[PDB]
Amino acid sequence: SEYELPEDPRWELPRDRLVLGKPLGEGCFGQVVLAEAIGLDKDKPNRVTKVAVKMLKSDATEKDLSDLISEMEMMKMIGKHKNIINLLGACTQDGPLYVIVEYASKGNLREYLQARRPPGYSYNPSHNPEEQLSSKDLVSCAYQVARGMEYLASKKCIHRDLAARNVLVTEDNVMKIADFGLARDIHHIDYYKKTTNGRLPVKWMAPEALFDRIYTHQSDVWSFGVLLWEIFTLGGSPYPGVPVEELFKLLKEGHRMDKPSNCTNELYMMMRDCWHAVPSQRPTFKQLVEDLDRIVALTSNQE
Ligand SMILES: */C=C\C(=O)Nc1cccc(Cn2nc(C#Cc3c(F)cc4nc(C)[nH]c4c3F)c(C(N)=O)c2N)c1
Missing domain, CATH: 3.30.200.20 (Phosphorylase Kinase; domain 1)
Structure with a gap:
């Protein structure tokens, strides 16, 4: 009032x-x-x-x-x-x-995926597990996120924190990017400070965002690569056992997370392309959408 x-x-x-x-x-x-x-x-x-x-x-x-x-x-x-x-x-x-x-009744994507892990990936932490996802379901998840980012980028929106915890899943299993409308903080930020769920957002940041606070559509594409890794580990934690100050070192020297156990070579190569050191050399979201569209159609729903 x-x-x-x-x-x-x-x-x-x-x-x-x-x-x-x-x-x-x-x-x-x-x-x-x-x-x-x-x-x-x-x-x-x-x-x-x-x-x-x-x-x-x-x-x-x-x-x-x-x-x-x-x-x-x-x-x-x-x-x-x-x-x-x-x-x-x-x-x-x-x-x-x-x-x-809009209301998303099935949680964020990390929780959605973890509850659908087979009891055999890391363990399934849900007390009421849900039915396992097919390979096609996982690629389709990635496709839908790519399509949402392609739309956001077309409107000149840079997300800056694209991660599975910022994708929500509706009752009809539609992926929806969340928390894109937020104004960028005018202050510098702490590299070690978790969110209220304890996430460590520095592990989704492109190196130019890490080192010089430059955020572009190209840095969202890097984060999308981390999200792809999260999808195919069914909600895994990036850079396991790597402390922050290590992470800075490691990325500079050019290593990258290892391929998930259950991930095709082609999708791993898409991850690695999203993690090109040079922002200009990463794929665009337009390209990712087109490639994931093709991969979905060719990916088996049978396993
Ligand atoms: C820190 C722990 C925690 O609370 N995690 C968590 C994970 C998944 C779902 C929830 C509960 N929840 N939150 C929302 C939401 C929302 C939302 C807005 F209210 C406003 C937004 N603007 C923009 C650009 N994005 C927004 C957004 F996502 C929902 C939901 N919408 O259904 C749920 N279920 C908590």
Whole structure:
């Protein structure tokens, strides 16, 4: 009420049409709760949709608020795509700011993959394992992420933290890139500081991002290579046993993670190409999409 929150009639949802439910997850993407929205779709005003609702914490500063507004406005400018988390609406009047986005019921991609490990990869940590993925399913996962990044890059959006923990999976097994709308911090950052889930984002950074804080579409392609490695280890942890100060050394001297046990030579070579030392020599997302499209069609669904 103290601030001028922007009301956009095309996106604004009355507060009374949002039935809030349980908090979602452990807060990696903010204070997010599950909800049911009534009549999100103006042609179907009596139908309910499950949605995720982002809000600010109790300790939120004016900086946290401006960031959430900016994230909302950035999602509008980027537009809709099947393979990103899409904006569905917002509540800016008669209460705290709510930003309403698509709900992904199967967790992030790392958790999705780990729960589908065969009991025979590292162990399956889920107490209720889910059915194993085919080789085609895994390549299709990579294809969908590539398609989401190709769309984001076409809108001049650089993700800067592309990783399996930032891909969410819907009930229909659609991959959606998350947390792309975020303004870049104006301060320098700590290379050793984990997120709230304890991830160590330096292991997804291209060397030019590591050493000189240069982020481009080409550095997202490097991260995509790390994500491909995460997919074919079914949620593995990159650079196992390598401390940060080692990692800096190792990348400079030109080594790269070893191929996952269950990964074709062709997909490993795509990983290695994404990890070209020279940014200009990496594939583009346009090329990756085309190549993964072809690989999906040729990859067996039988094992
Ligand atoms: C740190 C531990 C932790 O909480 N991990 C974790 C993993 C997977 C899923 C969840 C819970 N969860 N969060 C979301 C979300 C979201 C979301 C927004 F609210 C707003 C966004 N803007 C942009 C550009 N991306 C956004 C985004 F992903 C969801 C969900 N949408 O379904 C779930 N289930 C917690």
